[PDB]
């Protein structure tokens, strides 16, 4: 029937709000039959969860800046570089391995930027091999420097041994060419002691705090403590040179 | 004060101020998610429909290559209906299909059965590639009846999913090929008739979007074709299902 | 007359124009998709096991199909069928549990059923299936797991997956020739049969969320009590227990 025009609209929708089943069912049925709405809602959902995830990772990077930029981690590039690229990787991660040539290109193309190496184990069974590889790398880094650590790092990848195929025997076999016999013997005795190399414990604790457990990733950020969320980028271990380069420029700007 | 008809005035207002009724329906959907399940199954059904319609079109577009006189076949050259099969010898479903395809051939003697050697496993297991090359070589040098014997005999090994060895293939291939004809396909070449056949089969499968095996195309050989006589089954199926497809293709 | 009830009756009769603006609203406010999945998860917590077992038995040929990726013996006594959608960045991490289960059960078969739930980007699901299918076919089950875990790890840090994300990861798992052929099929719009088959099975199993599990012996047996259906994320002991029942 009929009623005051100014009251119909507001009253009709307030009634549906109070008693939603009848209009909820009829519209839901309409939507089940024109389900194209699902395709657009799902796109909006994932587009917004991506942004929300990134924002939350950026907050974590700002909170753990000191740990991320620790001078205890092997790095190349200047210690006071304006931008840092922090890399969480497992030597037995097969796509981290395939990313190594891209990272090497980034490093050559950005001699002014600090690249920090966070070795960690994706799975529990990798702890003996990851820990051993971190022991060797730390010895190489501490006695011969960052560029030489990077040779060792690339050489370990170049075995092509990934996803369980890299053994302690393999690491030792390569490591005899980078360590003195005395260093090598000291690494073997530490590994056999049951102790877990401190960098592996620290890196895994940091990965868990960063919500990177089991997941390789890059953090690109200015080193000087600035709360500018706009200069930080958190990127999956699988990425491109262009994407990492843009993050570097954003971290320098 | 201005007055109007409740029904349409309310509808026009909701349309221009959708948010509050929008929230009600969002909540209704969250608490009655069977409607989103229904919506998702309808999108799935639309996908199935468009997939089968596109398959049928692809079969008509690539008819000449699907029915090529160059591929191994048994049954009448100009049978009213054709059955085209893509397979790898170590595909477990293709192996289980083997006796089904034998029955169908015995049951349909005026239908053309076309064999598209499609060894999708040959990178994983090179014996899959060797077996396809031997099959081609038996067709090229011995004809369709001998090809079929070879083809059924090889599946009779029961050796699938990596277990098929060179010795399995060579032992059986000696009964169909001379030492020289067999020696010529022990390794793949970059040209030659066997290479050209396997390559065109591969490009055909890609044109059909047969990314796995087995795959079946049933269709009239005549160019004048009703889409309702064309059946494309891109996985394993039952004998009854192929037999009905053959009846439809017969007209 | 009373505005509320007759206004409601009129929309019930003539739902289309309200449906259209609500459809536009739902696309802009997609929170309801997440809440709907929680409600589906709750119903499944109290879903009845005997009725899931009967479903699993009805679809045993599809569940155990050799055409889906798997590890462990083809002729294993027991199979674990895992249904999953790559695009749940907020779901629980199952990779560590499944890695442990495969180690602890070297003589059990683990099968992988990727599919799209109602809230995922279906073209991305399709591209992920086409890549995994090539990896499975050309390199086998262990490599398929490699790829599978890599994609979950990528989606976790990214927070979502686009086709570009899948392509960027896929170049490390397929040759350029294989990847070009996948990209050709994907961008032509062809509907991937393996994904459509997986989705049809998931729907028939009432698995409307990710993940979900069917544990069963591979030999067709009369015992329904050797079958376990776990329609959600779960722990290693729960699945270990289902494996034990399937193996006896
Ligand atoms: Mg050296
Ligand atoms: Mg006949
Ligand atoms: Mg076992």
DSSP B53-105: HHHHHHHHHTHHHHT-TTS-EES-TT-SEEEEEEE-TT-HHHHHHHHHHHHHH
Tell me how far the alpha carbon of residue A110 is from its chain's centroid: 20
Q: Which residue has the tokens 């030489």?
A: A148
Lookup: tokens for A92:
């037995």
C-beta separation of B127 from B165 below 8 A: yes
C-beta separation of B138 from B176 below 8 A: yes
Query: Does B105 fall in a domain?
Result: yes
With contact defined as 3+ CB pairs under 8 Å, the chains touching B are A, C
Q: What angle do CA A211, A214, A215 make, to 5 degrees?
A: 70
Cβ count near C220 (within 10 Å) = 10
d(CA C87, CA C76): 30
- The DSSP call for residue B110 is T
Pairing of strands C109-114, C78-84: parallel
B15 touches chain A (CB under 8 A): no
B84: left (phi over 0), alpha (psi -120 to 50) or beta: beta
Ligand nearest to the CA of A180: 1
Resolution (A): 2.3
Q: Which residues contact B147 (CB under 8 A, 6 or more apart)?
A: B72, B74, B115, B135, B138, B139
Lookup: tokens for B81:
């209906």
- CA C105–ligand 3 middle distance (angstroms): 3
Query: Does B206 fall in a domain?
Result: yes
Strand order in the sheet with A114-119: A75-76, A114-119, A83-89, A217-222, A233-236
Query: Does B26 fall in a domain?
Result: no
Q: A3: which strand partners?
A: B4
Whether residue A4 and residue B2 make contact (CB cut-off 8 A), yes or no, is: yes
Whether residue B6 and residue C1 make contact (CB cut-off 8 A), yes or no, is: yes
Instruction: Using alpha carbons, list the distances in angstroms from residue B238 to B243, B244, B245.
Output: 9, 10, 11
Instruction: Using alpha carbons, list the distances in angstroms from residue C46 to C34, C43, C79.
Output: 19, 6, 24
Longest dimension (CA), chain C: 73
Gaps in chain B (C to N over 2.5 angstroms) fall after: none
Determine the residue among C141, C147, C153 to mutate to test chain A binding: the one whose Cβ has the most chain A Cβ atoms within 10 Å.
C153
Pairing of strands B112-117, B3-5: unpaired
Helix (H, G, I), strand (E, B) or coil at B142: helix
C-beta separation of B111 from B82 below 8 A: yes
d(CA B143, CA A23): 69
DSSP A177-224: TTS-HHHHHHHHHHHHTTPPPHHHHHHHHHHHHTT-TT--EEEEEESS
How many angstroms away from the CA of B50 is the closest CA of chain A? Answer: 15
d(CA C79, CA C59): 14
Helix (H, G, I), strand (E, B) or coil at C212: strand
Residues composing chain C:
248
d(CA C7, CA A15): 9
Q: C230: which strand partners?
A: C213
Lookup: tokens for A60:
């974590």
B44 touches chain C (CB under 8 A): yes
Longest dimension (CA), chain A: 98
B75: left (phi over 0), alpha (psi -120 to 50) or beta: left
User: What stretches of chain A adopt beta strand conformation (E)?
Assistant: 2-4, 75-76, 83-89, 114-119, 217-222, 233-236
Q: Which residue has the tokens 């070795």?
A: A119
- CA A83–ligand 1 middle distance (angstroms): 29
Among B148, B213, B134, B215, which residue's Cα sits nearest to residue B178? Answer: B134
Lookup: tokens for A128:
């003996």
C-beta separation of A247 from A220 below 8 A: yes
Query: Does A17 fall in a domain?
Result: no
Domain count, chain A: 1
Question: Which chain B residues are closer than 8 Å to C17 by Cβ?
Answer: 11, 15
CB-nearest partner of C14 from B6, B11, B54: B11
Strand order in the sheet with B81-87: B73-74, B112-117, B81-87, B215-220, B231-233
A236 touches chain C (CB under 8 A): yes
Question: Which chain C residues are closer than 8 Å to A50 by Cβ?
Answer: 158-160
Lookup: tokens for C38:
């929680």
The range of the structural domain enclosing residue A186 comes to 63-252
Q: B87: which strand partners?
A: B117
Lookup: tokens for A120:
């960690």
Determine the residue among A15, A31, A44 to mutate to test chain B binding: the one whose Cβ has the most chain B Cβ atoms within 10 Å.
A31
C-beta separation of C211 from C94 below 8 A: yes
Kindly tell me the burial class for residue B238, based on how many C-beta atoms sit within 10 Å of its own C-beta (0-12, 13-18, 19 or more).
exposed
The Cβ-side half-sphere exposure at C161, using a 13 Å CA radius, reads: 31
Task: Output the domain CATH number for residue B91.
Answer: 3.40.30.10
Lookup: tokens for B218:
């049933």
- The DSSP call for residue B246 is H
d(CA B162, CA A228): 56
- The DSSP call for residue C87 is T
d(CA B55, CA B231): 9
User: In this structure, which long-range contacts are made by residues C54-59, counting pairs with CB atoms below 8 Å and at least 24 apart in sequence?
Assistant: C54/C224, C55/C204, C55/C205, C55/C206, C55/C229, C56/C205, C56/C214, C56/C216, C56/C227, C56/C229, C57/C216, C57/C224, C57/C227, C59/C201, C59/C204, C59/C205
Q: Which residues contact A66 (CB under 8 A, 6 or more apart)?
A: none
Query: Does A58 fall in a domain?
Result: no
User: What stretches of chain C adopt beta strand conformation (E)?
Assistant: 70-71, 78-84, 109-114, 212-217, 228-230
Q: How many helices (H) and strands (E) does chain C have?
A: 12, 5
Query: Does A105 fall in a domain?
Result: yes
Query: Does B205 fall in a domain?
Result: yes
């Amino acid at each position: 029937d009929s009623a005051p025009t100014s009251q119909i609209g507001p009253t009709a929708e307030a009634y549906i709000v109070s008693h939603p089943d009848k209009v909820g069912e009829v519209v839901a049925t309409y939507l089940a039959e024109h389900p194209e709405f699902l395709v657009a809602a799902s796109e909006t959902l994932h587009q917004r969860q991506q942004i929300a995830q990134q924002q939350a990772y950026v907050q974590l990077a700002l909170q753990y800046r000191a740990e991320l930029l620790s001078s205890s981690s092997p790095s190349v590039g200047p210690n006071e570089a304006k931008a840092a690229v922090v890399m969480f990787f497992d030597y037995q991660c097969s796509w981290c391995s395939k990313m190594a040539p891209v990272v090497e290109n980034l490093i050559k193309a950005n001699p002014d930027t600090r690249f920090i190496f966070k070795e960690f184990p994706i799975f529990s069974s990798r702890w003996p091999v990851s820990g051993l590889a971190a022991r060797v790398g730390e010895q190489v880094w501490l006695t011969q420097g960052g560029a030489k650590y990077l040779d060792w790092h690339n050489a370990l990848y170049a075995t092509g041994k990934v996803e369980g195929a890299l053994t302690e025997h393999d690491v030792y076999t390569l490591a005899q060419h980078y360590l003195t016999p005395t260093q090598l013997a000291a690494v073997k005795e530490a590994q056999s002691s049951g102790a877990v190399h401190d960098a592996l414990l620290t890196n895994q604790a940091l990965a868990q705090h960063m919500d990177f457990s089991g997941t390789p990733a890059f953090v690109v950020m200015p080193q000087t403590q600035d709360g500018d969320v706009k200069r930080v980028t958190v990127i999956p271990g699988s990425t491109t040179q262009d994407m990492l380069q843009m993050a570097i420029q954003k971290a320098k700007g």
